[model samples]
Target: ADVFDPPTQYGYDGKPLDASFCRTAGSREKDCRKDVQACDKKYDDQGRETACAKGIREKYKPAVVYGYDGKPLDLGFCTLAGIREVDCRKDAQTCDKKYESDKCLNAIKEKYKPVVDPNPPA
Candidate 1:
């Protein structure tokens, strides 16, 4: 969450994003407490109690493969940002930041990159 900061807890697309992300984007909702909706046209739509349904607070399907030691990274982040392309239709306890990198997908990849493959069985 943005922790009372406007942007982190909210976004133009109504998904979790940093405050700096609000600078050049549009169609963002303050929060997605309801169903699929449209963002206001005036720049007057940005805050918590937030979003417009695209992340976890949308529809859900079979989550794509996520990896962390080849195990599912399906804890918190998987709920919101989703695995590959399946978004959950509820609020997510996690965000794309779980992996901690500037890029979302690349950051997620960072969480599981084979730090030590011990077997070496060819």
Candidate 2:
């Protein structure tokens, strides 16, 4: 079970910006919400609440993947900004051919490598 922590701040309507308010309000929703609201309003102005809600529900769905560091790594970051196939292959070949086990580990240690402290006794 999860706990829902309510916001302390008051909203534009002078009501406490709680969890229920967040669930129901338009302004609180992030990302595609603004476009969804605009789309809904366009249909709503023509007396089509059902169509408005349906359109908003269908068009406003958003998605993302989180990294091990709990940060959002976007699609383009994975595809475009990540390590190239040639470089990865080169790294693998170098590690395999030049060293084995412990030696391979030491050879692979670069600038951003994690260090294991040898806890020396006082």
Candidate 3:
């Protein structure tokens, strides 16, 4: 959960992210309340919602796998920024400002490349 800032509490999409994420943390959601439908929902073990049928608020499926460190790094940033190409979808180096070198980005891409299924798919 992001207690540091309101923006950290949110995913790439505009939805309640972590269970402990405070929508009312800053100037973002000035009127957010627990009584409201959209804000009322809580995430389940699989990241699905426990409340409303709206289910998971976040919709972007990562083409690349994510590496989990202490800090959270979102994979949907490229898509959220309007990029649709397979080459650019999971390139967080272009998106994340913290990782600002070719080596860092290369390492990410190496781990990020998804392993395709052995079986054929049309």
Candidate 4:
């Protein structure tokens, strides 16, 4: 099978940066080349093309959670949800059965809505 190889770096548009974009130079070049050969050999021995692809995908993909609609969810929303999950679990231990149903979780979401930043960096 053709080995799945990805560039060392990616562009802002999620494309692999072309080799012409940067030069390693001198000793760094030798080391870089050696590292590439080593990884190539390792992956080739494993004989799984999709393995490298999945590894690269996970390594570079943004760490954002997605909504049920498959759209990227807001990080702030996820943060608040995570906090509420912990709180709900703790409350469940204290005889709060709301954690077993979506009722308490829905209330928590409404009460702790994520505040959007009006002036995000450009």
Tens-place lDDT digits, model 4, residues 68-95: 3334443433454675665544333232
lDDT of 1 at 75: 50
lDDT of each: 0.36, 0.39, 0.40, 0.40
Model 1 C-alpha lDDT versus the unseen true structure: 0.36
Q: Give per-residue lDDT, candidate 3, residue 74.
A: 48
Minimum summed lDDT over a 10-residue window in model 1 is located at 53-62
TM-score of 2: 0.18
Q: Where does candidate 3 have its weakest 10-residue lDDT segment? A: 53-62
lDDT of 1 by residue, 12-100 (tens): 36654332343222223323222223434312244442322234222221233333332335454454444533433122223323222
Better of 2 and 4 by lDDT: 4
Clashes of each: 8, 0, 0, 0
- When sorted by lDDT, best at the front, the candidate numbers are 3, 4, 2, 1
* Model 2 ranges off by over 4 Å: 1-28, 40-46, 50-52, 58-122
Candidates in order, TM-scores: namely: 0.22, 0.18, 0.22, 0.19
| Two-way TM-score contest, 2 vs 3, winner | 3
Each candidate: RMSD: 14.6, 19.7, 13.9, 17.8
